Design an enzyme around this catalytic site. Structure first.
Site, PDB file in Angstrom:
ATOM      1  N   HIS A 185      -3.742   4.690   5.120  1.00 54.14           N
ATOM      2  CA  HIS A 185      -3.758   4.507   3.646  1.00 54.14           C
ATOM      3  C   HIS A 185      -4.078   5.844   2.966  1.00 54.14           C
ATOM      4  CE1 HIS A 185      -4.379  -0.161   3.792  1.00 54.14           C
ATOM      5  NE2 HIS A 185      -3.466   0.298   4.658  1.00 54.14           N
ATOM      6  N   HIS A 203       3.888  -5.328   4.221  1.00 49.67           N
ATOM      7  CA  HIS A 203       3.320  -5.737   5.538  1.00 49.67           C
ATOM      8  C   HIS A 203       3.642  -7.179   5.921  1.00 49.67           C
ATOM      9  CE1 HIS A 203       0.797  -2.304   6.790  1.00 49.67           C
ATOM     10  NE2 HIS A 203       0.781  -2.019   5.460  1.00 49.67           N
ATOM     11  N   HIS A 239     -11.652   0.752   2.309  1.00 54.99           N
ATOM     12  CA  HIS A 239     -10.509  -0.096   1.874  1.00 54.99           C
ATOM     13  C   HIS A 239     -11.032  -1.213   0.956  1.00 54.99           C
ATOM     14  CE1 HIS A 239      -6.715  -2.331   2.015  1.00 54.99           C
ATOM     15  NE2 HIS A 239      -7.444  -3.391   2.272  1.00 54.99           N
ATOM     16  N   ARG A 295       4.270  -3.338   9.786  1.00 57.64           N
ATOM     17  CA  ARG A 295       4.993  -2.753   8.633  1.00 57.64           C
ATOM     18  C   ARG A 295       6.441  -3.262   8.663  1.00 57.64           C
ATOM     19  NH1 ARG A 295       1.976   3.323   8.866  1.00 57.64           N
ATOM     20  NH2 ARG A 295      -0.015   2.329   9.397  1.00 57.64           N
ATOM     21  N   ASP A 317      -4.539   1.443  -2.345  1.00 53.96           N
ATOM     22  CA  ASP A 317      -4.799  -0.022  -2.225  1.00 53.96           C
ATOM     23  C   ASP A 317      -4.231  -0.783  -3.452  1.00 53.96           C
ATOM     24  OD1 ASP A 317      -5.878   0.247   0.289  1.00 53.96           O
ATOM     25  OD2 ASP A 317      -7.921   0.404  -0.347  1.00 53.96           O
ATOM     26  N   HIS A 349      -9.303   2.603  -1.518  1.00 51.73           N
ATOM     27  CA  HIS A 349      -8.361   3.751  -1.404  1.00 51.73           C
ATOM     28  C   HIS A 349      -7.489   3.875  -2.682  1.00 51.73           C
ATOM     29  CE1 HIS A 349      -8.721   2.495   3.114  1.00 51.73           C
ATOM     30  NE2 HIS A 349      -9.688   3.337   2.812  1.00 51.73           N
ATOM     31  N   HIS A 400       0.815   4.742   1.773  1.00 56.68           N
ATOM     32  CA  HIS A 400       0.285   5.479   2.951  1.00 56.68           C
ATOM     33  C   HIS A 400       0.381   6.980   2.673  1.00 56.68           C
ATOM     34  CE1 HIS A 400      -0.320   2.081   5.993  1.00 56.68           C
ATOM     35  NE2 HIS A 400       0.115   1.485   4.867  1.00 56.68           N
ATOM     36  N   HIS A 407       0.835  -1.232   0.000  1.00 54.81           N
ATOM     37  CA  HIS A 407       0.000   0.000   0.000  1.00 54.81           C
ATOM     38  C   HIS A 407       0.861   1.271   0.000  1.00 54.81           C
ATOM     39  CE1 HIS A 407      -1.874  -2.791   3.151  1.00 54.81           C
ATOM     40  NE2 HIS A 407      -2.605  -3.031   2.063  1.00 54.81           N
TER      41      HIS A 407
HETATM   42 CU   LIG Z   1      -0.394  -0.599   4.586  1.00 54.92          CU
HETATM   43 ZN   LIG Z   2      -6.696   0.842   2.024  1.00 54.28          ZN
END
Ligand SMILES: [Cu+2]
Ligand SMILES: [Zn+2]
Ligand SMILES: [Cu+2]
Ligand SMILES: [Zn+2]
Lengths: 153, 153
Positions: B63, B120, B71, B143, B83, B80, B48, B46
């Site tokens: 996000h 992640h 999401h 993370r 995403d 998002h 951020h 993702h």
């Molecule tokens: Cu993330």
């Molecule tokens: Zn998201």
């Protein structure tokens, strides 16, 4: 973006956090923070064109120079957008950074978001050194520490 | 910008280099590179909101979600902007990344330059896990590695 931030990392350990704020588009940018692990005295301080650290600070390329001008000091009309002059480290090897610049921006044609901030081995000679390299890099030598300039909350 | 780049680092063994290309303004973005030091299987991937790494990956925040949506996975209308779903590591712990996405951009209000790319601990459930967390983070957990997305040559 009204706010931006940069984590500086290189050997020593030369390391610091630099903050950016712009209250208005077409307003000045305030630059402030702290850098440790430096030799006492002035160190060149510049925005480099690329936000690329794949092989360390060398991947950042040249000074950010969207108008194709010569290297100067921050107060000069003939400068790179990236030319922020020098920061000064004390006897303990700590530089306390406090800059206001009217040429860099956090939006528009002069935007520095996604570029590299670099602190250098030697002092920047601000294009007054009377060699050809002076009006290109200011003779500030190797790249001690760098990071990418990101959008801050 | 037509090109962008990100170096992924963390407090453990996970590291990698990810590249971005956008041929036409408002056209598709290609994402490619390699990530090593992963557990075999799927890892959440993702953009951020903040390009802030001051305290490691947690400083990047939530996000990237400029349109105020739930999401989702990259293939869903309800997602998002940040995403990008999951990448897959083999038995040696290497993920070969290859993605085309038309929601992310390298310019305008969907612009990801100056934000943080994150890989992640766990798989992203793409908003399908039937808890309240699923339609906020996808339950991808901690993370492992991150970096700021920079303008490339
Ligand atoms: Cu993330
Ligand atoms: Zn998201
Ligand atoms: Cu420099
Ligand atoms: Zn310069």
């Amino acid at each position: 973006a009204t706010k931006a931030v940069c984590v500086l990392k290189g050997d020593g350990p030369v390391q610091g956090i630099i903050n950016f704020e712009q209250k208005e588009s077409n307003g000045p940018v305030k630059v402030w923070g702290s850098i440790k692990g430096l030799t006492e005295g002035l160190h060149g301080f510049h925005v480099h064109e690329f936000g690329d650290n794949t092989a360390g600070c060398t991947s950042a390329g040249p000074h950010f120079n969207p108008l194709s001008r010569k290297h100067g000091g921050p107060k000069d009309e003939e400068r790179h957008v990236g030319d922020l002059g020098n920061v000064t480290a004390d006897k303990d090897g700590v530089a306390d950074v406090s800059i206001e610049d009217s040429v860099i921006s956090l939006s528009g044609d002069h935007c520095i978001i996604g570029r590299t901030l670099v602190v250098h081995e030697k002092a920047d000679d601000l294009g007054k050194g009377g060699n050809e390299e002076s009006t290109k890099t200011g003779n500030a030598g190797s790249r001690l520490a760098c990071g990418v300039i990101g959008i801050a909350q």
